[PDB]
C-alpha cells in the first residue's frame, strides 16, 4: 500500500531498506541514491541526498507516503523543513533540531542549561583563560587543537594548550583550543525514536570507533558493532533513558526545536552514571546494521506510530547480532577504489551482508568507498554471533579490504 523512500547510500540505509521491505504495509520501496547492494531490496533513485529540490519533486510525483533520512547531511540542510512545507511525510529532524548533532558546542550548551550529564567542554582563544580552566579541572584531561592529546598531567595539558593556540589554525576569530573532560568507562550507543517529548528506546549497541585491532589507530565512522551489550547494566541503561534521552528530547522541545526521528546518544557508562559523549540526529552506522535485525516489530509501522505520537511497545529477538565492517585499505585516511571483491556469493544466506560502498561493473564487485561492506550474523549468544560472522567473513577475498578481528571482544572477554 505505502510507497516508501529512504535517503542515503551506505550500510545503514541498506539495513533500513532491508527492514522496511519486509513490512506488509510497504507497496514499493525506493532508496536515493542507494548502492548496488541495496538494489536487491529496493529500486534505486538516482538523486543526490543533498539535491533536496529534486528529492521533493520525486516524493510528490512518486506518491511517497513516508520518507526516512539516513545521513546527517540532508538533515543539516533542512530536508525535513522542505518536505514538511511541501506537506510530505518525513521521519527525521528539522534543521533546528538537527543542530543537536550539527554543533557539539550547541549540544554542550543545551545539556549544561538542562543539567544533562556529559563530559565537561570548553573552548578558549586566550591561553591565560585556558590555563586557569585547566588548573581548575586537573588531569588527565583532553586538549583538542584545530591534534587531540589526552594529557596525563596538568603540566602536559598546559604545554598542549599553548601549542594548540600557537600552532593551531588561525580562524577568523583567531586560533582556538578545546578542553574536554576525560571520562573512563564502557562506551555504548543508545538510539531511540523520538517525537517531541515522547521517547521510544531502541536496543542498545556498542560501536568500535578505532580503525584497528585493540582499538588502535585513528577514529572512524565505526568499524563494527553488536547488540545487545551485556556489560551495560539495565540500571545504567535506565539511567541513560531518564537522565539523558528523555531530558534531551524535552530540552530540544523547550528550546523551540522539537525533535522527530532517531535520537542517537553516543554515551559512556561511567562509575557515576551514563554521560553523553556525542549526540547524533539519526540512526548510527553500523549500529543500524546490528540493531534493526533484532527488531521484531515492523519498522515502518513503528515509525508511523512514533510520528502519530501513539504508544508503542517495541519487541526484540533474544538473539544477539554482531557485524564487522570491511573497509578499503587506508580508511579512514586516503584509500583507493577498484579492488575486485570476490566470494560475495559464497556467504551463507543467513548472513546479513549490508553494502556501504561497493560498485557493480562487468558482472563483478569492486570496492568503492571508505567503508565498503559489513557482514553481520545472528547468534544465540554474542559469542556465537561473533563466530558465525568472522566465519563467513573469511569467504570474502579482496586484497583491497581489511577489518578488525576484535569486534565484540569487549562483550565476550
- Residue pair 221/370 in contact by the 8 Å Cβ criterion: yes
> How distant, in Å, are the alpha carbons of 100, 150, 189, 376, 392 from that of 288?
19, 30, 10, 11, 20
List of residues 6+ apart from 302 with CB closer than 8 A? 193, 200, 295, 312, 314
Expressed as residue numbers, the domain containing 175 is 120-183
> How distant, in Å, are the alpha carbons of 16, 124, 195, 198, 254 from that of 311?
22, 45, 11, 9, 22
- Residue pair 357/347 in contact by the 8 Å Cβ criterion: no
With cell 511525510, the residue in question is 89
Instruction: Kindly report the number of other CB atoms within 10 A of residue 279's CB atom.
Output: 28
Identify the H or E element spanning 141.
strand 141-145
List of residues 6+ apart from 155 with CB closer than 8 A? none
Across 288-380, where does the E strand assignment appear? 320-328, 340-341, 352-355, 358-361, 364-367, 371-379
End-to-end Cα, the chain, rounded Å: 47
Cis peptide before 125 (omega within 30 of 0): no
Q: Are residues 273 and 373 in the same domain?
A: no
Q: Are residues 176 and 188 in the same domain?
A: no
Smallest CA-to-CA distance from 405 within 392, 385, 380, 386 is with 386
- Pick out the residues of the known binding site for AMP: 181, 183, 187
Give dist(CA 161, CA 147) in Å, integer.
11
- CA torsion through residues 334, 74, 283, 323, sign: negative
CATH number for 288: 3.30.470.20
Give dist(CA 261, CA 259) in Å, integer.
7
- Residue pair 25/2 in contact by the 8 Å Cβ criterion: yes
> How distant, in Å, are the alpha carbons of 89, 149, 395 from that of 84?
7, 43, 46
The experimental resolution of this structure, in angstroms, equals 2.2
Q: Are residues 198 and 311 in the same domain?
A: yes
Instruction: Kindly report the number of other CB atoms within 10 A of residue 364's CB atom.
Output: 11
Q: Are residues 189 and 140 in the same domain?
A: no
Smallest CA-to-CA distance from 285 within 225, 331, 335 is with 225
Give dist(CA 215, CA 373) in Å, integer.
19
Three-state DSSP class for 125?
coil
- Paired strand residues for 367: 358
Q: Are residues 275 and 259 in the same domain?
A: yes
Give dist(CA 201, CA 316) in Å, integer.
12
Q: Are residues 213 and 198 in the same domain?
A: yes
Give dist(CA 82, CA 76) in Å, integer.
12
Q: Is residue 212 part of a domain?
A: yes
- Pick out the residues of the known binding site: 181, 183, 187
> How distant, in Å, are the alpha carbons of 86, 192, 406 from that of 33?
21, 25, 32
How many structural domains comprise the chain? 4
- Residue pair 239/189 in contact by the 8 Å Cβ criterion: no
Three-state DSSP class for 11?
helix
DSSP state of 323: E
CATH number for 134: 3.30.1490.20
Q: Is residue 114 part of a domain?
A: no
Give dist(CA 412, CA 228) in Å, integer.
12
Q: Are residues 75 and 25 in the same domain?
A: yes
Q: Are residues 335 and 412 in the same domain?
A: yes
Give dist(CA 182, CA 3) in Å, integer.
46
List of residues 6+ apart from 254 with CB closer than 8 A? 114
Cα-Cα-Cα-Cα torsion 49, 53, 55, 59, nearest 10 degrees, comes to 160
Amino acid at each position: 500500500h505505502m510507497n516508501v523512500l529512504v535517503i542515503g547510500r551506505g550500510g545503514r540505509e541498506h539495513a533500513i531498506a532491508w527492514k522496511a521491505a519486509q513490512s506488509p504495509l510497504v507497496g514499493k520501496l525506493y532508496v536515493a541514491p542507494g548502492n548496488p547492494g541495496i538494489a536487491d531490496v529496493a529500486e534505486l533513485v538516482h538523486i543526490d541526498e543533498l539535491d533536496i529540490e529534486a528529492l521533493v519533486q520525486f516524493a510528490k510525483q512518486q506518491a511517497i507516503d513516508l520518507t526516512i533520512v539516513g545521513p546527517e547531511a540532508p538533515l543539516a540542510s533542512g530536508i525535513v523543513d522542505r518536505f514538511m512545507a511541501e506537506g510530505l511525510r518525513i521521519f527525521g529532524p528539522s534543521q533546528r533540531a538537527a543542530l543537536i548533532e550539527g554543533s557539539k558546542a550547541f549540544a554542550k550548551e543545551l545539556m549544561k542549561k538542562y543539567g544533562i550529564p556529559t563530559a565537561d567542554h570548553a573552548a578558549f582563544t586566550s591561553y591565560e583563560e585556558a590555563k586557569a580552566y585547566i588548573e581548575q579541572k586537573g588531569a588527565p584531561i583532553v586538549i583538542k587543537a584545530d591534534g587531540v592529546t589526552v594529557a596525563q598531567t596538568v603540566e602536559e595539558a598546559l604545554a598542549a594548550a599553548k601549542a594548540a593556540l600557537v600552532d593551531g589554525q588561525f580562524g577568523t576569530a583567531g586560533s582556538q583550543v578545546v578542553i574536554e573532560e576525560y571520562l573512563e568507562g564502557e562506551e555504548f550507543s543508545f538510539m531511540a525514536f523520538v517525537n517531541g517529548e515522547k521517547v521510544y528506546p531502541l536496543a542498545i549497541a556498542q560501536d568500535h570507533k578505532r580503525a584497528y585491532d585493540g582499538d588502535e589507530g585513528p577514529n572512524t565512522g565505526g568499524m563494527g558493532a553488536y547488540s545487545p551489550v551485556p556489560q551495560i547494566s539495565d540500571e545504567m541503561m535506565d539511567a541513560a533513558l531518564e537522565a539523558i534521552l528523555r531530558p534531551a528530547a524535552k530540552a530540544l522541545a523547550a528550546e523551540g526545536r522539537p525533535f522527530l526521528g532517531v535520537l542517537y546518544a553516543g554515551l559512556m557508562a561511567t562509575a557515576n552514571g551514563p554521560k553523553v559523549i556525542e549526540f547524533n540526529a539519526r540512526f548510527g552506522d553500523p549500529e543500524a546494521q546490528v540493531v534493526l535485525p533484532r527488531l521484531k516489530t515492523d519498522l515502518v509501522e513503528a515509525v508511523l506510530a512514533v510520528m502519530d505520537g501513539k504508544e508503542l511497545e517495541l519487541e526484540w529477538t533474544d538473539e544477539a547480532v554482531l557485524g564487522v565492517v570491511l573497509a578499503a585499505k587506508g580508511y579512514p585516511g586516503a584509500y583507493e577504489r577498484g579492488a575486485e571483491i570476490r566470494g560475495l556469493d559464497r556467504i551463507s544466506p543467513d548472513a546479513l551482508l549490508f553494502h556501504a560502498g561497493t560498485k557493480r561493473e562487468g558482472g563483478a564487485w569492486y570496492t568503492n568507498g571508505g567503508r565498503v561492506l559489513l557482514l553481520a550474523a545472528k547468534g544465540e549468544t554474542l559469542a556465537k554471533a561473533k563466530e558465525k560472522a568472522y566465519e563467513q567473513l573469511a569467504a570474502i577475498d579482496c586484497d583491497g579490504l581489511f577489518y578488525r578481528r576484535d569486534i565484540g571482544r569487549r562483550a565476550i572477554e
